[PDB]
C-alpha cells in the first residue's frame, strides 16, 4: 500500500538507477542514500518520481 | 514354595508354554540362566505366591535355589500367563512389596462406606534373613473420605521403608445408590 | 557516578530541634531537621 510510495533512486551524473521505496507516513523526506550505479563506485543516488 | 523348574536351551518358547513347560527367566547380579516351570502347578502355587513368598526352583541339575518373582507376562488377549521373571535372593537387605493385612472396622465403615485398599503392595526394604510374612495396617477410627498412610503401620525391627512417606496406604469412600438418579440431573 | 550532569554532592549539617550537630555529605549544602 501507498503512503510508502515507491521510487527509482535516480543518480546525478546524468542517470544510472537503483530502485527502492519511500515512507511518507514516516518523517522521511526525499532521500539521497549512498548507492552504486551501473557505472562507477558508491557515489551518490537521490530520489525521483514514482 | 515348591516348584520343579527345568533348565532351558535355545528352543522356541512357543513350544514350551504350549507343551506345559512354561517359559520363565531368572537372573541376579550377573546370572541370567534359562529355565521353565510347568503350566498347572506353577499357576496353582502362584496364587499362593506373588512377591510375598520365597519360591524354590528345584532344577534337575542337582541344584535347588530360592527366588522372588518380578515382571510377569500375561498374553493380553485371552489374559493368562506366558512368561515370568525371577530375581534370585541373597541375605543382605533388599527391596520388595509388603501386603497390608487390613485390621479394623471403623465408623465410616459399618455406617455405610466402602474400603479403599490403595497400596495393597508397598515398596519396602527388608533383610532377607528375616523375611516378614505380612504387616497389619489398622483403620480403626477412620471415617469415609479420610485415610491411613505414612508411618501409621507396623515396622518390624528388620523392616525399613521408603515410599513417600505421605502416600495413602488405604482409605474409605461413600457407597453409591439410586439417589444418584436425583444427582443425575 | 561519573557521566555528565550528576546532581552533585557536598557536606551538610543536621541542626535539629534538640541540639544535634551531625556532620553529613548530602546533595544539599545546608540541611537541618528535628532529630
Amino acid at each position: 500500500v501507498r503512503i510508502k510510495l515507491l521510487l527509482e533512486c535516480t543518480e546525478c551524473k546524468r542517470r544510472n538507477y537503483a530502485t527502492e521505496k519511500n515512507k511518507r507516513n514516516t518523517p522521511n523526506k526525499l532521500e539521497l542514500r549512498k548507492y552504486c550505479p551501473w557505472c562507477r563506485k558508491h557515489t551518490v543516488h537521490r530520489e525521483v518520481k514514482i | 514354595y515348591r516348584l520343579k523348574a527345568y533348565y532351558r536351551e535355545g528352543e522356541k518358547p512357543s513350544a514350551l508354554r504350549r507343551a506345559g513347560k512354561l517359559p520363565g527367566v531368572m537372573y541376579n547380579r550377573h546370572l541370567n540362566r534359562k529355565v521353565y516351570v510347568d503350566l498347572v502347578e506353577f499357576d496353582k502355587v502362584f496364587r499362593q505366591a506373588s512377591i510375598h513368598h520365597v519360591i524354590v526352583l528345584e532344577l534337575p541339575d542337582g541344584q535347588s535355589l530360592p527366588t522372588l518373582v518380578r515382571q510377569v507376562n500375561l498374553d493380553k488377549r485371552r489374559r493368562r500367563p506366558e512368561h515370568v521373571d525371577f530375581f534370585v535372593l541373597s541375605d543382605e537387605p533388599v527391596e520388595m512389596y509388603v501386603p497390608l493385612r487390613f485390621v479394623g472396622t471403623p465408623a465410616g465403615v459399618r455406617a455405610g462406606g466402602v474400603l479403599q485398599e490403595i497400596h495393597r503392595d508397598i515398596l519396602v526394604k527388608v533383610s532377607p534373613r528375616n523375611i516378614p510374612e505380612f504387616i497389619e495396617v489398622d483403620v480403626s477410627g477412620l471415617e469415609i473420605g479420610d485415610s491411613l498412610h505414612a508411618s501409621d503401620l507396623k515396622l518390624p525391627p528388620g523392616v525399613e521403608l521408603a515410599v513417600s512417606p505421605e502416600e495413602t496406604i488405604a482409605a474409605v469412600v461413600p457407597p453409591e445408590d439410586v439417589e444418584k438418579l436425583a444427582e443425575e440431573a | 557516578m561519573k557521566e555528565g550532569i550528576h546532581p552533585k554532592l557536598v557536606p551538610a549539617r543536621i541542626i535539629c530541634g534538640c541540639g544535634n550537630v551531625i556532620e553529613t555529605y548530602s546533595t544539599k549544602p545546608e540541611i537541618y531537621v528535628e532529630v
Partner: protein, 141 residues
C-alpha cells in the same frame, strides 16, 4: 453422560481397531469387574445403560471404578440426503476399546452380588463380556 466439552478437533475420523488393549487390563481398583471381548468402539450411552441397570438393581450399593472414557466423535450424518455435501457431525461420543481391557469394576460388595450385578451390567454392553476378581492380576501399574 460425561465427556469433554471442548477438545481439539471436533470432526475426528474413525481409524482402525486391531487389538492389544494397549495396557490397562489388570485390576488395581475395585473388588469385581468387567472385561471386553470384541475389539472396537464402545458407546458412552451404553456405558450409562450399564451404570443405570447396575446401580439401579443394587440401590444403596458400593462404589464404581470406570476405567473407560468415551471421547471419540461419531461421524453421523442427516437422513434422506445425497452423498458428499460434507462430513459427519460429532455425534455419539464413544471410546477405543479392545478385548481384555478391564472396563469397569465395583468394590464393597459381596461375590454373588457383584456376579449378578456386573452380569447384567456387562450383558447390556454391546458385545459379550467377562467378569474378573483381583487374584492373578498382580503388579503391573
Amino acid at each position: 453422560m460425561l465427556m469433554p466439552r471442548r477438545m481439539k478437533y471436533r470432526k475426528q475420523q474413525r481409524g482402525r481397531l486391531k487389538g492389544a488393549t494397549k495396557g490397562g487390563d489388570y485390576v488395581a481398583f475395585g473388588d469385581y469387574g468387567l472385561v471386553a471381548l470384541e475389539p472396537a468402539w464402545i458407546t458412552a450411552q451404553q456405558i450409562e445403560a450399564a451404570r443405570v441397570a447396575m446401580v439401579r438393581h443394587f440401590r444403596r450399593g458400593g462404589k464404581i471404578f470406570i476405567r473407560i472414557f468415551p471421547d471419540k466423535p461419531y461421524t453421523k450424518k442427516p437422513l434422506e440426503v445425497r452423498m458428499g455435501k460434507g462430513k459427519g457431525n460429532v455425534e455419539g461420543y464413544v471410546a477405543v476399546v479392545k478385548p481384555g481391557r478391564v472396563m469397569f469394576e465395583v468394590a464393597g460388595v459381596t461375590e454373588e452380588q457383584a456376579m449378578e450385578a456386573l452380569r447384567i451390567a456387562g450383558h447390556k454392553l454391546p458385545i459379550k463380556t467377562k467378569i474378573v476378581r483381583r487374584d492373578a492380576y498382580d503388579e503391573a501399574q
